[model samples]
Target: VETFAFQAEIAQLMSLIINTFYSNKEIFLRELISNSSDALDKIRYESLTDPSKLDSGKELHINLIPNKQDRTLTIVDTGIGMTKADLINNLGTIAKSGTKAFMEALQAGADISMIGQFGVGFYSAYLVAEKVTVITKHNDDEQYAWESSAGGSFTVRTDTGEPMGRGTKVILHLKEDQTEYLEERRIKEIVKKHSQFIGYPITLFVE
Candidate 1:
């Protein structure tokens, strides 16, 4: 396992994201689904030149798996999954150019529609989750898990679970106050409102 602290600027931005969006936290799901959509788009575009990119054979879609027993909501996508280095950089760095505008937008408190546009929307997981675990496997690399509590640091380690082949699985451990997200109905409502128009198929698995 490897652990690394967030860059000072990133930690500050994460704190601001969690605090600022706590009341309007449904957007977190929208942002996540949008990210998955983008990932699927990348793999699709790449497949035109490299058919092997779709060799995993899983359909290009997003799956929402909610487990009430664990109070976790997992969003899975057969997309262009990340490498270990990507987990570190993408999750740890927020671009400097957008920092001023993102914080200002948060401070404004009225037009908050653009929070995800700054690419800091991943941190919004903290608004409803005490912990977030990302299990991802790239076509060229071994599977790994990135776990964080939105603290100063996060951990990355080789995944011991069954091979999940060529995709990213994000599991949010819902806080007590956010248990509503563990409900299929509630999550479907949020998805319908924010992600219904996304190009890829989004499915919520219900048992």
Candidate 2:
């Protein structure tokens, strides 16, 4: 089977960043929640003029649902979901261009995502989960599910159900040996340490 089908040496380079540099696997939740917050920030600013952007009573927050039965952990967010293309562009290729100037200066000008670092950080989800599925809904593009594996390559398709609102759900299928994450006791502590006081309601659901 094929593995790590990034654009070029990008995968090797990313493996270094993801496995070597950004080594802490536990911080994946922190990075992701931070990303969700960033997305919600954009949504909050945009909703200034557009109140209806959010549903009548929709609340923006992050939901972490852990299912031991299915051996899956799904993180749902009411932040800015992504388009089909957004899912592909953001998740498929972890390394975006502009690395030249990015590495040149300590205070570099680069889109956070394109910096190639956090992209690998996001990919950090793969550290525990063998398969990662992203279901995101954006005003620009209703709802789409993007699925991928360490073997490289990904597929994005429209959701079978109707798109509910602006949000994203990241479902991580835990590796067989790495099943401890399904334990609410441990995972909850991790969440508390990394992202407890982010000024948002983070609901943890067990299944």
Candidate 3:
């Protein structure tokens, strides 16, 4: 249920991130949203020509929820969901290009693409999160959850909760940092500054 490990190189690279990227940790939200938008974009394109392939239907929006009671911040995207293998492959290793395999699962042969090309951008969650849990349900597979602390290892398992229908939900357990990222006022500012022109609606539910 929980037996995935990252090599020493990952450890060393995270140390490097801790030193260089902590100051700009806010960028993690931006990058995640960017990828979320890309997921929606891919589904949008697929729906036009192949309606049955649309995973989450027409829900092309993003939702950010701050779970204070649990000390977690969750980012939601009603877009392409990752399969069970994805829970491992996407979170277990660091990023690279040329680009990677499971991506073919993101949309079959559609050639759907996005930034974060270097593979390291997604790891930016380490900038603020001590533990990251990703719950996803792909159209072709059952629900699965991915968990990691950005430490030596990570894990995946069948989701116990109801199916997410389709899309991805990333729950981030914040570090002790003041605004690792959940205050309503500041989060609005952060989202507005970078995503105003993006196609999707960026909504925050602080409740």
Candidate 4:
């Protein structure tokens, strides 16, 4: 029942992710799929400690579906998912010490080598998405949906269908200017560049 909120500086961080990290633009898909691979790693590690809590029948994989008609792209993963609290804290707030602390460390001339450890990679979706819809199921909780325009606020509510079976699906409602990412060839190249070394399967669908 815990609610999440963003820090005052989160606006700056979100802007940085959307504008700077996406300068290459095509890299957005790579960043999102990389995040999905990381989530799978998290769940796989957890399963080693609590096998009974693991959700069954889901593979540790990432899938991309592009809808040219709607100019939207969907990235689906059967990996660890966020609960309500996680969505609030992770999507809403900049609570991860890695981001702020990395910035502070850079100012101090310290190496900022571990910024990615904070898990900011997921937010890169905003670079391409005009709106985002997240559908997720967790081992300990029911399925839930979170929606946002990456503007100021987001809304979360329970999902009425069968649970996701485990993992998360992120639907990116692509901006008019970002529709190039919906191309299968373009998406594959980006995925190859950033996530080909990832230890899980990554697939793409177009048209």
Candidate 5:
């Protein structure tokens, strides 16, 4: 796989996403699931041209699991996964982000009031999480693991285990100050609010 450099403005953009949007952190799961839905849409569209590309037989879905023993919350989806290059581009830089477009559309009277724009949605996890681990498998490439504290830097490496069929899993290590998100009711409410119309199924496990 190839490695790419992050744009110079990525750090500042990340800071803005984390600090400015963190106050509304419950939307993290919603954003993640929404991204998953988009991924599924991409693959579904691609499959029209290439039938062999449909790898994950299961219908697209999102699952939320909370582990009290570890104080960790995980959101998993059977959607499009990213390759090494995708990781660098999507997480490391702000290029091709719908955020700017969404903002512009809103300003132009598009009324995207209910939808989230930009890759800023991913950074919302940092609001309640002290650290985050992302394990992803792309049908076109090998599986990869990405870990970060949302601080100065993040670490990426090859997956130690088998590639997930075709999807992404995000695990959040919650901070002491924001444990309320651990509740099933809260997670479900956020999902219903931001993602009910996202064009996929979302499930949550509370206990």
Candidate 6:
């Protein structure tokens, strides 16, 4: 019952950005894919010094699963995920200490093309999803679930349902107006446009 709130800046910026700014919503897909690519690289880099990092046998890649009936789109990545503290710090807070510069740029009429730079790209999910769920398992920690509605707060808990091995799975509960993302062709188009050159393979699930 101890639900934590997003960072004060994050909560304010979530509303400011999602409600009145960052209109090109397709970038959410790109942002998420970029995040996955980063995670994959983290694990890949770690494995260079610690071979056991790959012992999970989870293939290093990304999977896009769209369930029209369920009105949900899931992005799964076999990458370095998060521990509880990581989940809270990474997802709940604005990443890094560059927040001041990012805000200054935003208020200075600068082109906000740098979506992933400030770690606010994750908030882009709120543009299409009323709710977001992150199930992550880090090699150094057990699995955990982080759920949020971008409504000022989020919840985290231990995941006991199924083992996720070593990776992160992000589920976006689409808004009714965003059903187009549930189409295989549409998702493929997005992937082709933005993530075509991603180092890890991106496989879309076919029904």
Tens digit of per-residue lDDT, candidate 1, span 1-207? 999888777778767766663477788899889989999999999999999888875589999998989999999999999998888886454454465678777677634457688876677777788999999999988899999888788899999998887899999999898989888788889998999799998999986
**What is the per-residue lDDT of model 4 for residues 26-137, given as tens digits with 9 covering 90 to 100?**
6567667777887899898988898765645447888889999977899888888877777766554554555676557646864322335555556667777878888998
Score residue 129 of candidate 5 by CA lDDT. Answer: 86
Q: Write the per-residue lDDT of candidate 3 for residues 5-112, one digit (tens) a residue.
A: 765555545554455433556777877888788878877777788888764466678899997778888889988878876666654443533124324333364222
User: For candidate 3, what is the lDDT?
Assistant: 0.71
Poorest stretch of ten by lDDT in candidate 4: 110-119
Q: Residue 90 CA error for candidate 1 (Å)?
A: 4.5
**lDDT-best of 2 and 4:** 4
Which has the greatest lDDT? 1
lDDT of 6 by residue, 124-182 (tens): 78878989999999988989999988878889999987898899999999989889899
Q: Candidate 3: list runs displaced more than 4 Å.
A: 7-11, 19-21, 90-94, 98-119
Number of the candidate with higher lDDT, 2 or 3: 3
lDDT of 5 at 16: 50
| lDDT score, candidate 5, position 151 | 51
Tell me how far the alpha carbon of residue 162 in candidate 6 is from the true structure, in angstroms, after superposition.
Answer: 1.6
**TM-score versus the correct structure, for each prediction:** 0.92, 0.78, 0.81, 0.82, 0.80, 0.92
Candidate 2, after superposition: displacement of residue 165 in Å?
A: 1.8
- Residue 92's lDDT within candidate 4 is 44
Q: Report how far residue 207 has shifted in candidate 6, in Å.
A: 2.6
Over all chains combined, what TM-score does candidate 4 have?
Answer: 0.82
Clashing pairs in 2: none
List candidate 2 stretches off by more than 4 Å. Answer: 1-5, 13-23, 90-120
